[PDB]
């Protein structure tokens, strides 16, 4: 999958202008994702990383942006904060990683 | 309001965040 130019890009767009690119017609190696943890944070809600290999998903969505460390807490179900209230509200039943 | 400096504390360093969304075929597992 064309993930080299997306994850390893030199510059990322702004948070207000986050770039979303549709990914289709390729094979994604999730074994790299769940068998290695170079990524400090890996939070998945509603899905199991084990069943990713044995399941096929359609219309894959990926949002990438840059934020600061202490705001990771606020992006969670059943949580309050300035950002989650006045900037952008996420559903409580959000499913993804 | 964001403070990004080389001499800042390690805490204020920027973080790349990638969120994968699933909404209820072409892409599958790494073959078998």
């Amino acid at each position, epitope marked *: 999958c064309p993930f080299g130019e997306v994850f390893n890009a030199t510059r990322f767009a702004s948070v207000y202008a986050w770039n979303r690119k549709r990914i289709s017609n390729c094979v994604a190696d999730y074994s790299v994702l*769940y068998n290695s943890a170079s990524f400090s944070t890996f939070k998945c809600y509603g899905v199991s990383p084990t069943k990713l290999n044995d399941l096929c998903f359609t219309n894959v969505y990926a949002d990438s942006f840059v934020i600061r460390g202490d705001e990771v807490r606020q992006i969670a179900p059943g949580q309050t904060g300035k950002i989650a209230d006045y900037n952008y509200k996420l559903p409580d039943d959000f499913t993804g990683c | 309001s964001y403070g990004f400096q080389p001499t800042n504390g390690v805490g*204020y360093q920027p973080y790349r965040v990638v969120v994968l969304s699933f909404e209820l075929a072409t892409v599958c597992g790494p073959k078998k």
Partner: antibody, heavy 121, light 107 residues
Framework: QVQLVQSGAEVKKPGESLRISCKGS????????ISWVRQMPGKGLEWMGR????????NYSPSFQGHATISADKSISTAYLQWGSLKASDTAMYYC???????????????WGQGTLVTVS | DIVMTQSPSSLSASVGDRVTITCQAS??????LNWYQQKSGKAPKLLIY???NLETGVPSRFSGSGSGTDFTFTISSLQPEDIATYYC?????????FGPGTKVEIR
């Protein structure tokens, strides 16, 4: 003068529930990850996972079976590990250490405790 | 499905020469590497972790360096009691995987 002391060795009969504790003091307990390390006697270490008291997020080792769950209490700022049904595989000694801060990126477990030995027989 | 090999298994060199062993994983492991010393009648125990944190009382003879796919091992002072089995050790924040290992004996 910060000192961290773990609980002593515990031996319990099969079928009984045992809870071990690791207490941190002199710092924000929920602002630092707590790391747990398991080792079978006569063999090497098996790194199972670490839990943040901020959200109680649980990460499992690839050889996990879901038998044991990790819970933390934010009221007393003390880490706990519980086994609902002790078995032969639970016989080991465990190390609890303060992991990398969630703000830092270079991993480190700063301090070493004396360890807590759990024996099932 | 995963087949990894370590080469060369055996090396012959004169006294004072440098011997370096390399072990590679399926993907890049950055600098996640530790060194274990295994005795005959004793179990291996981790002494230095992350190669940058030193526990009180741990001798300085153990050290680690290198990142990516190339690693180099340097002996500050060779000792007769240094004979052991060195295991390439990769780890992450999710878990840990034991490598096959390579048994090297020095007379």
């Amino acid at each position: 003068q910060v000192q961290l002391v773990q609980s002593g060795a515990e031996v319990k009969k099969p079928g009984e529930s045992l809870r071990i504790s690791c207490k941190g003091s002199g710092y924000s307990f929920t602002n630092y990850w707590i790391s747990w390390v398991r080792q079978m006697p006569g063999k090497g270490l098996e790194w199972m996972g670490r839990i943040d008291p901020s959200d109680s997020y649980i990460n499992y080792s690839p050889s996990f079976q879901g038998h044991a769950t990790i819970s933390a209490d934010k009221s007393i700022s003390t880490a706990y590990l519980q086994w609902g049904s002790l078995k032969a595989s639970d016989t080991a000694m465990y190390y609890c250490a303060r992991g990398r801060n969630y703000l830092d990126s270079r991993g480190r477990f700063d301090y070493w405790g004396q360890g807590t030995l759990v024996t099932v027989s | 499905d995963i087949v990894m090999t370590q080469s060369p298994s055996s090396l012959s060199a004169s006294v004072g020469d440098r011997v370096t062993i390399t072990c590679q994983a399926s993907q890049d492991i950055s600098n996640y590497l530790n060194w274990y010393q295994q005795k005959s009648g004793k179990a291996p125990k981790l002494l230095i972790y992350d190669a940058s944190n030193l526990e009180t009382g741990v001798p300085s003879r153990f050290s680690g360096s290198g990142s990516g796919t190339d690693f180099t091992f340097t002996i500050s002072s060779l000792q007769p009691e240094d004979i052991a089995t060195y295991y390439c050790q990769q780890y992450d924040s999710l878990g840990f995987t034991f490598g096959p290992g390579t048994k090297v004996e020095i007379r």
